[model samples]
Target: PQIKLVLLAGVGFFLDAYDLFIINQVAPMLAQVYFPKTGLPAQRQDLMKAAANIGCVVGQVMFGVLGDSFGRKFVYGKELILIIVATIFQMSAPSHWDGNRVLTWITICRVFLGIGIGGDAPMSATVVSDRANIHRRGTLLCFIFANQGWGSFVGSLVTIVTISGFKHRLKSGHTHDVDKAWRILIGLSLIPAFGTLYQRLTGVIASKKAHWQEFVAYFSTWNHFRNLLGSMLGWFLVDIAFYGINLNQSVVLAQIGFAGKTGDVYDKLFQLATGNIIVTALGFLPGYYFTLFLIDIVGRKKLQFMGFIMSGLFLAILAGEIDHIGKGPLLACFTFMQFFFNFGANTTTFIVAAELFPTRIRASAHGISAAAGKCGAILSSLVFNQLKAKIGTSAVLWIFFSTCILGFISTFLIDETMGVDPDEKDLEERRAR
Candidate 1:
């Protein structure tokens, strides 16, 4: 049952990582392929990157509330349906109409894609937590989340493969091959999302229906409201750092002189992809695995607090030495930041939100919290580049650093739920019993 539940629920996160990270790679291709002379405008680039997160915010709150009001099973496969459909539409958007036309069309599709992926957060977390024991719930969630690493790595691998396959054409001074690679990169996301579409609603669903009035009654209470704020605040702060740092990964590499500045188009893309693969393997994947190993042992709060301090310091080092440092030190700090992000606040915020709420309101609360995180992600996407151009990337890193410190302080508000009994903590359930 754990395996089944994790498998089905885990697929959403797989798509989430692929969808988010691929845009980082593919968006640049769009700029080179469609608008090679001037490059993609800064505003359009930021908007396209943030489109999914905007949709995610809406999807998280809307689907979450519906899951609570109806049942988790009721909304199970719905998000994926939208996701696959939107993904196909994005890949197929007509480029011949005009450069801006295709970019605009794809950005709209990105929102719809995000809506589906966003709902996965609260729904999957709630779904897995419903069945797992308190002591072992972290393992279940961590195992589910580890698919994010796979999705990102696979996304990078696919980009490298497709790009290499079309290398000759791309090298010959035509960008049509990059266009093909971009389409292939996005279109393939449908395969993984398809694998678990059937399994989504079938695996040990908790059919308990949530009441709106009951939610108001419970959450309006100070104890419940406090938890919601704590979880939401924690999610919000971490996402600003995570999304701000990650969404601008290419820019950072370029700033650090790791990106191949004086190379053919194919060579530059290959260098970028190689760096991406390294970051995912060494930093992204390992961090999640270590978190899985220690989350239940160290407990959520301690790990969450510790992660913030380390990740903040890493980012600070990057900001402090931005002008002086070369590729190795820059890459190492970036790697360390990715590691702590997965090992610390990024994963813990979701677990805490899902764990803190009751069964009836768990999906709703988690969604609300998850939505806050996406909001932070959206803010970073909008500001990171714009701010980078004005104040410099170093200043941008400092902004992210400040948020991590704030996130650390925010972690104190959320109580640790390790080995805590769900039923005992549910006031309404206790009263009823």
Candidate 2:
């Protein structure tokens, strides 16, 4: 059962990674393709690039509702089916249009896809949070969430390989083949969805029904508000950094003298980006493998506090490097920034949310918090594309650095849940302390 749960949860990570990373990978290509060589004005293209994230914001809210109202097993599974269908349509949709019409389809499909993305955030977070032992809840959540980084790496690699092979055709005025590659990239996401379908259908489902008084008692009380506020605050800070840094990092390579057909830059970029996977994993891996061991030892307060402070420091360092060294130093500092950011605050979020509410309202709390995070991601999409494009990469790094400050301040109000039994009446009181 634990294995199955982990596997299913991992699939959520897989979907999260696939969806987010693909956008990062495709952003440059899309710019070069539909809006190629000044076809669309730069500013307009930037906004168009941000359309999917806007859609994601809406999608996350919808999923959060469905996940809370229905069982995670049922709601999450259905979302996968929807995502698969949408991805298929999206991959095929581009083939049916030209210029802005293609942009319209892309935006529409991304919104549908964003809905699934939003749903997965809370549902997946809840699943791992529910199943993992309290001592290591942070660690479990971290590992699961780190899949986003891996997804980004894989997405970038795929784009590089695909584009590399066909440079000859593209330069010689062959657009049709390059266009087909984009479709193939989008369609391939279907495999992960299909692979997990059986488990999603058959997995044991937690009940979604809530006691009427249990539900009614909360909104009328200050205690409930505190809990809600804490959860939302945590979600907000995390999203700011997560979206701001991770999304923009990939685009940095393109800006930092890495563009071209020479393949050497690609290899160097990948080499430097080793921190991309490593830092994210380090930041997340300990949270997963060891949090179960330490949440009780260190308590949630200390763990998360440490996470936020350290993440902020790293972002500051990255920002400084980007400011001074320009692209070259920015390239070197990239991995460290990712490593520290994830290390500090990424996974503690799930640990905090799961422990915040009782089982009756767990999914709802998860959804609300998850919704806020996706909103952050949506904000990042728009901000990263338009703002970064206009002001340049260092500005992007600095913006993320500010978010880390928010995360650190937010951590002060955080309630630690380490060593508290989920079933205990004392759990809430302990967390509050």
Candidate 3:
């Protein structure tokens, strides 16, 4: 049952990471093909990157309410179908058309994709959390969430291989090959989504009570509202720093000499993927493993608190010396920042949200928290580029540092939930009342 749950739920996370992060690999190629002379404008660039997040916020809130009111089985595979459709539209986006129209189409497709991604946030986490053994709940959930790292890593690997395969053609002024490269990358994400659809169709795990009543009961009490606030605020703060770093690491890499040959767009794609793959392998993957193996033993709270502090410490150091450091040392600090961010708040926040709430409203609560985190990601994606330009990257690092400190302080709002049965606790509250 546990393995089955992991296979069912974890694949959604895998697709989420791949679909979201793959944009980084393909966006520049897209600009090169469609926008041509001026390249993708800053406004369009922000929208393209953030469109899915916008959709995510809407989907999470919508699906969260629906998942609780209806049934998990009723909603399970529906989002995956949306993702498959949007990805197809994204792959079919026009080239050499009126620039604005092409951009509009791609952005619209991504918004639909984002909705599917957003729905998975609560659906997967809730299902896995509800079904796992209490003692191993954190372990199982963390393992599922850890697929984000693997998704990112696999996206990088795919970019590396595909771009490298097309490297020579790209150099010979066959720039259309660049378009093909991106299409293939976006198209590849459909594989996993397709693979997992059958299981989601078959999986049925919603409550017997009317979803409407559960939805109303969820917000009708102070205790329910408190859990909601704690998870939502905590996730919001963590994502501000998290997406700010992930979406913009290429800028940092460019500063460190990983920018490929100026004329060779394919090479640049390969180099960027290489740098990301390295950082993800060294820091991000290990951090997830650390959480997977030790979350139950160390407890979620301490790891979260420590993760925030350590990530902040590294970001501060990188900021102080960013202008002065060489590639090696700069990469080191950056890698450490990635490590603790995952080991710390990123993984912990997701697990805590899953474990803290009761079964009746678990998906809804987790959806709100995850949605709030997406809001932070949207804020980071939209604003960080402008902030880095205005205040310099050094100052932005400090700003992220401040957010980390805020996350650490926010950690206090949540109770320690290690080995606790949330459903039983809910029963106790009802008995007391």
Candidate 4:
């Protein structure tokens, strides 16, 4: 494999990262951009949040199968094009005086961008495993997946700098500062996308076959079936826990004792903005290497358990300490949890999905596990706010903690794939005989 291709692979993910999250920072900016007066209605914001996700589901199922037909590289180029085109439309959607049309348009384009984003997942994931040496699977995957953190951090970082750069003008009634700032941020998503297209378009990726009936044949048995279930269960619960915390992360500082729920726009905005990066930049980034270094050494099974245990313990501590801990310790607890999260199942589950299956079932298995994670994401995203409202946000941390133990247990279902060849024709041949 060319260094450019894998490097481009990591680059593409950062591009995906900005679109997935920067909208969070962009949400308020959009309000500033077009809805300065009546405010961004809670009613309309739901569409923007839901749009990409809806297309994501469609793309996942659609591309997962198509990748089987034409080979992953072919599908990869097409998806990259879709994302770039959709993002162009997404970022450039003209504003309206009433503000309604523009946000909806952003949602419209986001759906297409999301379709492409969804398709990219199984391809990117399976691509690594298809070509990677068995020994380096965890280490290389760890290296690749870390793009998401920097991706989010760069977005969050730009959000602050842009707002800070234009703060005086925004306060002084120069609304265009916000207008330009938001576009600048969204527009930046294109740079990496366009840059990486060379690899997806020009580079060759070698990869496989056997259709759905055969798929059922392999997985129907208890032996093969349980391995599929293991990673699926692992990915499912991991997302449930992480997205559950992050979706309502806006509320975390207040509940944990940062201060009041009420404040003017910029004050609260910057607080949330800075908090975004604090969470984005710290322990978790380091944790990627922590896992990267150890995953192959400690073995995937032990590292995941270690990460889950440490992660859950922190969540429990946060829940218990919410009332007692001040800003110092609370911030410490928050980032520390972020550390274990990346260090644990978040990274390991993806690696396991990649390593655990044979070449015939590889991408499909990875896609399904990834798809399960999306369900877990939607489940928590749907349930977290509702649960928090009823039981209080503090208690939801315990629920998040529960997912770790759940994730921990799911691993028991599959043997460790570390040091095993995914393409072991020797094993497959013997099993059939």
Where does candidate 4 clash, by residue pair?
Answer: none
By the lDDT metric, which is better: model 3 or model 4? 3
Candidate 2 lDDT, tens digit per residue, 128-203? 6666656566667656665655566566556656666666666576765656767766777777778877766661
Query: Between prediction 1 and prediction 3, which has the larger TM-score?
Result: 1
lDDT of each: 0.81, 0.61, 0.81, 0.75
Best model per TM-score: 1
Clashing pairs in 2: 59-115, 60-118, 135-292, 136-291, 136-292, 139-287, 139-288, 140-288, 307-344
Of the candidates numbered 2 and 3, which has the greater TM-score value? 3
Residue ranges of candidate 3 with Cα displaced over 4 Å? 34-39, 65-73, 98-100, 198-227, 260-263, 426-433
Residue 175, candidate 1: alpha-carbon lDDT: 62
Clashes of 2: 9
lDDT of 2 at 102: 75
